[PDB]
Amino acid sequence: AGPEMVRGQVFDVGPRYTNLSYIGEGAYGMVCSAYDNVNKVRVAIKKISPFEHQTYCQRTLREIKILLRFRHENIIGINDIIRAPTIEQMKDVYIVQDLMETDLYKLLKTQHLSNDHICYFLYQILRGLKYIHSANVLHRDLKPSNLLLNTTCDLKICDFGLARVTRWYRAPEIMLNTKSIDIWSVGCILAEMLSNRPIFPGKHYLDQLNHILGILGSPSQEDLNCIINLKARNYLLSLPHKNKVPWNRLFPNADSKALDLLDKMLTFNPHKRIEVEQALAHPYLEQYYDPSDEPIAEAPFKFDMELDDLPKEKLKELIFEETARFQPGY
């Protein structure tokens, strides 16, 4: 037989996983769907090739430990991990996850969402985020392609590769210098569900700022009273005045409760931005909000080691150890 190959990438995941097809990619790897001949369903297999770069090694170890600890309906998990039987041979890691049918990015390219569906998707994003944040974890890269959907509108957040204890979805703080950065991203996603287009599609860093200011209007002095990059501050002060554009002009036929929540998520000042529990409790989400049925994590997630300080080789060792429990005869 042999090991299978997909678009230039070896996928050494047989014999349990076969019939592979491309379904996505990342900076240092690729995702395929595959047939699992044990559970008799198709799965997703995420191949990661990180070991040349320390940063990639850090993220890979964070992603694995986070996801193996988390357990939540609106969060992608890990069912299996494949890697070589010896550390000298381990060049790749294969993370096996539940297969989802599509993502919100694709959905928004092809479909108009009803207000009820927007409401329901927003609720599930926030319910999952509430769990994440309750563990004192930040996702940091929420965007429509990281929101997976199955046939029945169940939603799951994926790609925890940037999790810690994308320009269009990037909060102003990030560019002008916390859980509030995920809230900003969710705001951008809500706006995108409302109009089927990204609200702040900047082509570069400066242009991103101009797009935000183009809607929010010139920042107040309180908005600028904070630690801020000098270049950014000087740049913003060099700009002419910008008027605030009212949400109901940008989104003429949107539910007014949806816009009220949007306004609170897309607040320039992170300290004034709505937090996830308040967002779930907002009137827009009344029909789904159910604090009886919104799990939080038992304890805040913490790492025992300073991953930032460790050399690649030590991290690779840790990855080898973390993944050992999935090896046969363990």
143 annotated binding-site participant: no
d(CA 317, CA 330): 17
Q: Nearest distance from residue 63's CB to ligand 4VG, in Å?
A: 8
Give the number of other Cβ atoms within 10 Å of residue 116's Cβ: 11
Beta bridge partners of 75: 157
- State both tokens at 324: 């050992």
Residue 27 annotated in ligand binding: yes
Q: Around Cβ 303, how many Cβ atoms within 10 Å? A: 13
Find out whether 215 and 172 touch, Cβ atoms under 8 Å. Answer: no
Residue 187 labeled ligand binder:
no
Indicate the residue among 100 and 129 with the shorter CB distance to ligand 4VG. 100
Annotated binding residue 26: yes
Least Å distance, CB 321 to ligand 4VG, is: 21
Q: What's the CA gap between 183 and 169, in Å, rounded?
A: 10
Q: Which is nearer to ligand 4VG, 49 or 115 (CB)?
A: 49
Q: Please confirm, yes or no, whether 141 is among the known catalytic residues.
A: yes
Distance CA 215, CA 243 (A): 8
Q: What is the dihedral of CA 13, 18, 19, 22, to 10 degrees?
A: -20
Would you say 29 is a known binding-site residue? yes
- For residue 32, the tally of other CB atoms under 10 A from its CB is 26
Nearest CA to 260 out of 283, 277, 278, 244 is that of: 283
Work out how close the CB of 55 gets to ligand 4VG at its nearest, in angstroms, rounded to a whole number: 11
Distance between CA atoms of 257 and 63, rounded to whole angstroms?
Answer: 35
Name the closest residue to ligand 4VG (Cβ).
26
Closer residue to ligand 4VG in complex, CB, 23/265: 23
The beta strand positions in 150-229, using DSSP E, are 155-157
Q: Which residues pair with 148 in a beta bridge?
A: 103, 156
Q: Please list the alpha-helical segments (H only) found in 11-170.
A: 54-69, 104-110, 115-134
Please tell me whether 77 is known to bind a ligand: no
Q: State which residue, 119 or 158, has the beta carbon closest to ligand 4VG.
A: 158
For ligand 4VG, the closer of residues 44 and 61 by Cβ is 44
Catalytic residue among 141, 159, 182, 223: 141
Residues at the site binding ligand 4VG, with contacts judged by CB under 6 A: 23-31, 44, 46, 48, 97, 99-100, 102-103, 145-146, 148, 158-159, 161
Q: Shortest gap between Cβ of 93 and ligand 4VG (angstroms)?
A: 10
Known binding residue 294? Answer is no
CB closer to ligand 4VG out of 53 and 264: 53
Q: What angle do CA 83, 85, 87 make, to 5 degrees?
A: 80
Alpha-carbon 89 to chain mean position? 31
Annotated binding site for ATP: 23-31, 46
The residues annotated as belonging to the active site are 141
Annotated binding site: 23-31, 46
